[PDB]
Amino acid sequence: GSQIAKEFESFLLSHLDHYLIPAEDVAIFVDTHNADHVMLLLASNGFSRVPVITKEKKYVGTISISDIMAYQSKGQLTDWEMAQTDIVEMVNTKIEPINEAATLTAIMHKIVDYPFLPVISDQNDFRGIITRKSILKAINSLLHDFTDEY
Amino acid sequence: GSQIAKEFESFLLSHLDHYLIPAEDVAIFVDTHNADHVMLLLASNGFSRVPVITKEKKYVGTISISDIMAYQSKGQLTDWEMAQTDIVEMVNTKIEPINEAATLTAIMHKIVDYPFLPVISDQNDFRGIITRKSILKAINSLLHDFTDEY
Ligand SMILES: Nc1ncnc2c1ncn2[C@@H]1O[C@@H]2COP(=O)(O)O[C@H]3[C@@H](O)[C@H](n4cnc5c(N)ncnc54)O[C@@H]3COP(=O)(O)O[C@H]2[C@H]1O
Ligand SMILES: Nc1ncnc2c1ncn2[C@@H]1O[C@@H]2COP(=O)(O)O[C@H]3[C@@H](O)[C@H](n4cnc5c(N)ncnc54)O[C@@H]3COP(=O)(O)O[C@H]2[C@H]1O
Structure with missing residues (x-):
């Protein structure tokens, strides 16, 4: 019950660069x-x-x-x-394109209509992409952690 | 803490037909x-x-x-x-294609490699499709419910 909700807070408030496919x-x-x-x-x-x-x-x-x-x-x-x-x-x-400072909640709402989003800096530098596969993998790791309890 | 974990049990153990785009x-x-x-x-x-x-x-x-x-x-x-x-x-x-009796955990693991999965019956009848957008929308409704508490 307890550890479940915080894993979601750490997910929702996590940085965009965790899910980014770097420009290289x-x-x-x-x-x-x-x-x-x-x-x-x-x-x-x-x-x-x-x-x-x-x-x-x-x-x-x-x-x-x-x-x-x-x-x-x-x-x-x-x-x-x-x-x-x-x-x-x-x-x-x-x-x-989405800014590299974009919230994961903001990602969730945009990635429903787009197979991928190109990520930019404030100076329009290309930082990479957020794919639906990347987000879907992150959701699966999270569910993998809640199946540990019950 | 409490209501959070059960919403995930009801999500993980939910029927495939909740996320299906019917054949029509x-x-x-x-x-x-x-x-x-x-x-x-x-x-x-x-x-x-x-x-x-x-x-x-x-x-x-x-x-x-x-x-x-x-x-x-x-x-x-x-x-x-x-x-x-x-x-x-x-x-x-x-x-x-995935069977209409397929688990949502089984969907999660397959939908990471496929933009969509065609759904079939045991007699190879076409039942519709599971798209990544459908699953992503379901995850967003779930997160929408946990932002209600904190
Ligand atoms: N070479 C490969 N090896 C393994 N699986 C492959 C693959 N090519 C495509 N797929 C699978 O097909 C999905 C849709 O591919 P699509 O080329 O239309 O659409 C892709 C493509 O337009 C773009 N994309 C993904 N990775 C890229 C990369 N490294 N460089 C450039 N564009 C990329 O993002 C879209 C969504 O990507 P996502 O990964 O979520 O989803 C991909 C992935 O699950
Ligand atoms: N007419 C439209 N109106 C609004 N948004 C649109 C659209 N056409 C495409 N998109 C957006 O683009 C995504 C990828 O489309 P795609 O045609 O390559 O790839 C699609 C297509 O191959 C298939 N698909 C989706 N809905 C379908 C339908 N009703 N009938 C047949 N095939 C469908 O499943 C793939 C993944 O679908 P998903 O919905 O997750 O993801 C879709 C959706 O988010």
């Missing part, structure tokens, strides 16, 4: 890379959607193969033309 | 439908991956636009040829 371990795209090779790398990494950053590691947005395809068809561009265009042009900006 | 509300494909229109409907529903069922509502597998594209390129098939082929040929069978 996040497959990203530099906004100046060509679109044809991005379509190629996305087929090799296997991720449906990845973050887009600048050379200074500043957050721009996210990209998927769908985004690249929508741009090519909307602009009627050829395959060769795409290999001469950078990602900036077709970058998705719909996902609003 | 799941966008599916009938295994005999043409592949070209499936590529079309997948662009209208917006789901990255959906279940594939038979006319008798028996579970077959799942489909995505990637699966359709991989089949067309691997078989070198033309656009018109795809409109004359049914989904059965390119159906993904990697996701193992």
Whole structure:
């Protein structure tokens, strides 16, 4: 009864960096890379959607193969033309990044609509991502601790 | 302290049907439908991956636009040829469906690797799906109840 409630206080008031997949371990795209090779790398990494950053590691947005395809068809561009265009042009900006100072309660409410959230500093530096898998793993470790009592 | 632990017992020992998105509300494909229109409907529903069922509502597998594209390129098939082929040929069978009698602990451990799980009966009837969003919403309602005390 007692130890159960405090484990939740220590969970709810815990830091965001406990659940973060650091920027080094996040497959990203530099906004100046060509679109044809991005379509190629996305087929090799296997991720449906990845973050887009600048050379200074500043957050721009996210990209998927769908985004690249929508741009090519909307602009009627050829395959060769795409290999001469950078990602900036077709970058998705719909996902609003979360600050690294964000509460875990604030994470819980946002991660219900997003498979992942990109994490930024106050100066728009890319810090990594919060995935639903990371949060789900944290919930499972917590439940693992309450099955110890009864 | 007291009311906290029982809410978790009632959560952990709860039925799967509390978190299920019933079969009626799941966008599916009938295994005999043409592949070209499936590529079309997948662009209208917006789901990255959906279940594939038979006319008798028996579970077959799942489909995505990637699966359709991989089949067309691997078989070198033309656009018109795809409109004359049914989904059965390119159906993904990697996701193992969960029984409707499955424990919520068993759900927790499986939903960490899968955005969704297709739910089946003992006779392979499709019952619906368990999404990560459904589980994440259930965790949030639970945390909402413990913030009431302190
Ligand atoms: N290489 C792999 N090995 C093992 N399991 C894999 C995997 N690729 C995908 N999955 C599984 O599929 C889920 C959805 O993947 P998706 O690529 O659509 O969606 C992913 C992707 O868009 C992004 N993501 C995850 N890890 C990433 C990373 N290290 N770098 C860049 N983006 C990442 O976050 C979304 C949600 O991720 P999450 O981990 O919660 O959930 C992942 C994970 O459970
Ligand atoms: N039309 C829409 N309206 C609002 N939010 C939307 C949406 N489409 C996608 N999302 C959001 O994106 C998440 C990942 O979507 P995705 O299409 O890749 O992946 C989905 C899709 O493959 C499947 N799914 C969810 N609901 C479905 C349904 N009613 N019929 C068929 N498949 C469904 O389960 C996966 C995980 O679903 P989940 O709900 O946890 O997570 C969803 C949801 O949070």
